[PDB]
Structures are given as C-alpha cells and as structure tokens.
C-alpha cells in the first residue's frame, strides 16, 4: 500500500495472507468470507505468462495477522488448502477480466477478535454504494513504494467514474472491473502496490453498519502514479459464480 497508514488491531479481521511454503514468502492478500472459504484474485494462483500455476500444496493462508513477517503466536491461525477454484472465464491472456478465485480450507478456522468474515454484497448494496466519489478501503502488506511495511497498511480511496478509468489506460476495461484512486487535482494520494493484489476493497454500508467486500485488488500500471488508477475485480458481478462454487463444493 502506497501512502497509507498502519492498520489498527482488529481493523480488518477478514484480511488473509496468501503465503508460499517454499520459499517462505508473501504472495498476495485474500479475504475470509466464511469459516472455510477465502476469496482472492485468480492471478495470485494462475498466471501462465510468468509460469505461475500453484497447486493446493504449494500454499498456506495466514488469518488474523497484523505484523507482516512475525509469527503471531496465539493470534494468527495458519490453514492448509483443500481445493482451489479459478473462475472458468478468467482472462489471463488479455486483461485479467474476471480476476477472482476461491480457496476452500481443509478445516474451519475459529473466529476470534482478530479473525472474522466480511460480507458479500447483494444487488442493492452494490447499486447503492458503487458510485463515483464513494470511498472504499484497501488493506495489505505490499510494497510502500513503486520499501516493505512492518504491519498491515490501510488506505481509503474513492471510486472513479468509468470514462475516467477507461481514459487512463490502453487496457480494455470490462464491466467486471472498476477503478479507484485520487485524481492529480484532488491532491490526496494512495494506491495498492506489489503484494497487495488479491486483497479486499471494502465499504461500510451506512444502512446496516456492516462491511461489504466490493472489490478485489486486481491490477495497476505502477503504484500511486498521477493520472493512473488501481483496478479492482467487481465482486457483485461475479457473485453467481461464487455462490455456485460454494453451493456445490461447500458443506
């Protein structure tokens, strides 16, 4: 996260670290959506252009964390993956369209002060809150500059008008993406960066005072560049896929 701040303790209890077993490194963010399901970006698991194609056994998820590198004894829980599901129409060949994936945990994680699921939006919540100007929140342990944080970082960023998103890049933008970030004339700054991808863009509904995951940190061109914006997977648009997977392969 560029130009963010240290998270408060328990501020993002759905935040998950995707962690490579060997060598031991942070791959991506992710989020806890139930006791056995974790949401992340498909490109965190599968990206053929870079010979990335992880299996379940290559990976761990670390839940309840604050410190990036410390093993947080008695706080964090580490879970093994039962099964990975990648969206069938995830477009790694072109523009990361449908950059979403689910991970089913071998066993349910226990909720606690530090571990708790975020909500997925319903159609009305999306309609109501996914508006230009409305701010969401992005969290992660990625780089501080286009170095690395001691603890989980947080930044609030406004959703951006679709024509402006489109006009900022040569990449083809789809209805399964939205962009967020400050304009050069707005003065304030902030973005995700390397290692933040797969984590959540969340909003707090003013109607029922619950946090909803509206986006997944998907891609950008640089970090916190003037006239550029971070692009996020539109979670509500893919929710039928999410629900299908969980209905069929969940217990």
């Amino acid at each position: 996260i560029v130009e963010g701040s240290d998270a408060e303790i328990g501020m993002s209890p759905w935040q998950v670290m995707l962690f490579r077993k060997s060598p031991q490194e942070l791959l991506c963010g992710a989020s806890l959506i139930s006791d056995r399901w974790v949401l992340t970006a498909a490109h965190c698991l599968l990206y053929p252009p870079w010979d990335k194609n992880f299996t379940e056994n290559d990976l761990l998820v670390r839940i309840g964390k604050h410190s990036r590198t410390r093993y947080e004894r008695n706080i964090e829980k580490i879970s093994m993956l039962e099964k990975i599901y990648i969206h069938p129409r995830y477009n790694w060949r072109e523009n990361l369209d449908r950059d979403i994936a689910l991970m089913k945990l071998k066993k349910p994680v226990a909720f606690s002060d530090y571990i708790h699921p975020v909500c997925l939006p319903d159609r009305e919540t999306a309609a109501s809150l996914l508006q230009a100007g409305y701010k969401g929140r992005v969290t992660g342990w990625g780089n501080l500059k286009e170095g690395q944080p001691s603890v989980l970082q947080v930044v609030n960023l406004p959703i951006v008008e679709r024509p402006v998103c489109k006009d900022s890049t040569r990449i083809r933008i789809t209805d399964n993406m939205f962009c967020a970030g400050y304009k050069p004339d707005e003065g304030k700054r902030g973005d995700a960066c390397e290692g933040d991808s797969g984590g959540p863009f969340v909003m707090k509904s003013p109607f029922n005072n619950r946090w909803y995951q509206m986006g997944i940190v998907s891609w950008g061109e640089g970090c916190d560049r003037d006239g550029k914006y971070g692009f996020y997977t539109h979670v509500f648009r893919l929710k039928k896929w999410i629900q299908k997977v969980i209905d069929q392969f969940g217990e």
Binding site: M11, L120, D122, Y134
Partner: peptide
C-alpha cells in the same frame, strides 16, 4: 451471507469506531 458477517469484534460489536471509517461515511452523499 453469514448472519454476523461484516461486524468486527473490536469495533462494531463493542460500538467503537476506527480512526478513518468516518471518511468513508462522509463520502456517501
């Protein structure tokens, strides 16, 4: 969705506000 989703034990459950959530509320015009 799970019944208790999106309500943080250290914030919503205890009626404590985090340091920047108000910035989000203020944007929801």
């Amino acid at each position: 969705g799970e019944a208790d989703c999106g309500l943080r034990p250290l914030f919503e459950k205890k009626s404590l506000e985090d340091k920047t959530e108000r910035e989000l509320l203020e944007s929801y015009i």
